[PDB]
Ligand binder design. Structure first.
Ligand code: G14
Ligand code: G14
Length: 355
């Protein structure tokens, strides 16, 4: 890399790893559109396997950005609309609280208080129907944001119904393949297991458990190289050859709702650039129910935004942030779930210096 980039990344990440006791980490900086890669520590402590550019990390909720984009792609294909009622794609959702809950509400955590987690006890798919049928909104649709896997997870399952593809097939063929994300997986194939890092919770090696709507909400694993490429695509959607994908990206970065300084996209979340670092840093701390202001009609993707997403599993912590107008981005993948504000802080420190 250029020395400027080498120096800011290292002087920022090294202390962070030390402070947080992160066993392994990979970082990519997109600078004037090109990727620069850094790796530290261990993919697998027991087997002494280092983190490389081919190491797979659990993205956790950064998976939601893929889901938003696949969702946006289905829109641009004319297969679904965000203004459609949920019942249009799940007619079995006959319970009366569902009247007026749209795909928009599902994708943006504004349905009326769908819970953060689908319960563990929901194994079968009729258990799932029961869960949504029996769910009681705390609020009218489109009035409060409460971040929820059961909300965007559902949007992801429904968005791919008209295609007739499974979520995974749809994701692989419509998002992963066109973008050349050849080491990105909903389900890690046995061929790639050698590269699958372990996560670490309280010093114990852990992989993400199977659960309802996992793939749609928190189930993607990826390498720093593919993740960099994800940032490049989202930075420059209009260089993407596939028409509906290109628009899908643009749709995921539209501003549908505003809470405080932040705007809710599809998966992605957005602030006006330049940004107050304390507004993103403290903003990122991990139930926070917030009133939302509808942006009528949604603002198309603003190039002068800080576009970002945090993501966690029991054993992993990820962060992606990019600034379209600066052609600037960062991916940070760690095999420990460490505080969000530390991530955002490291990321702002790096990006601010290169801007
Ligand atoms: O193997 C295939 O080509 C395949 C997999 N799924 C489909 C498909 C499913 C629903 C509607 C259209 C095609 N084709
Ligand atoms: O033909 C090749 O060189 C080729 C295609 N894919 C790979 C590859 C497979 C797994 C991990 C990394 C590269 N090599």
């Amino acid at each position: 890399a250029p020395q400027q980039i080498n120096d800011i990344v290292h002087r920022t990440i090294t202390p962070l790893i030390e402070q947080q006791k992160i066993p392994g980490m990979a970082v990519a900086v997109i600078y004037q559109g090109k990727p620069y890669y850094f790796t530290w520590g261990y993919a697998d402590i027991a087997k002494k396997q280092p983190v490389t550019q081919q190491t797979l990390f659990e993205l956790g909720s950064v998976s939601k950005t893929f889901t938003g984009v696949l969702g946006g792609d289905a829109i641009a294909r004319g297969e679904i609309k965000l203004s459609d009622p949920t019942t249009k794609y799940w007619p079995e959702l006959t319970a009366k609280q569902w009247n007026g809950i749209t795909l928009l509400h599902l994708a943006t955590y504004t349905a009326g208080g769908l819970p953060l987690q689908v319960p563990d006890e929901v194994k079968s798919s009729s258990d799932l129907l029961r869960f949504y049928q029996n769910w009681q909104p705390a609020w009218a649709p489109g009035t409060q944001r409460l971040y929820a896997n059961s909300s965007i997870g559902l949007f992801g399952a429904l968005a791919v119904k008209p295609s007739g593809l499974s979520f995974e097939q749809a994701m692989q063929t419509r998002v992963f393949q066109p973008l050349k994300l050849n080491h990105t997986w909903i389900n890690v194939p046995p061929a790639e297991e050698k590269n699958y890092a372990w996560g670490y919770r309280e010093g114990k090696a852990v992989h993400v458990s199977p659960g309802a709507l996992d793939a749609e909400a928190y189930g993607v694993k990826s390498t720093i190289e593919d993740m960099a490429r994800w940032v490049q695509s989202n930075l420059k959607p209009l260089d993407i050859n596939e028409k509906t994908l290109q628009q899908g990206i643009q749709l995921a970065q539209s501003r549908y709702w505003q809470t405080g300084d932040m705007y809710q996209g599809l998966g992605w979340e957005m602030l006006d650039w330049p940004v107050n670092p304390d507004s993103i840093i403290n903003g990122s701390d991990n139930l926070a129910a917030r009133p939302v202001k509808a942006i009528t009609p949604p603002t198309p993707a603003v190039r002068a935004s800080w576009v970002h997403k945090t993501g966690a599993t029991g054993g992993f912590g990820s962060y992606v942030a990019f600034i379209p107008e600066k052609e600037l981005g960062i991916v940070m993948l760690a095999n420990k779930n460490y505080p969000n504000p530390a991530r955002v802080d490291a990321a702002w420190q790096i990006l601010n210096a290169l801007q």
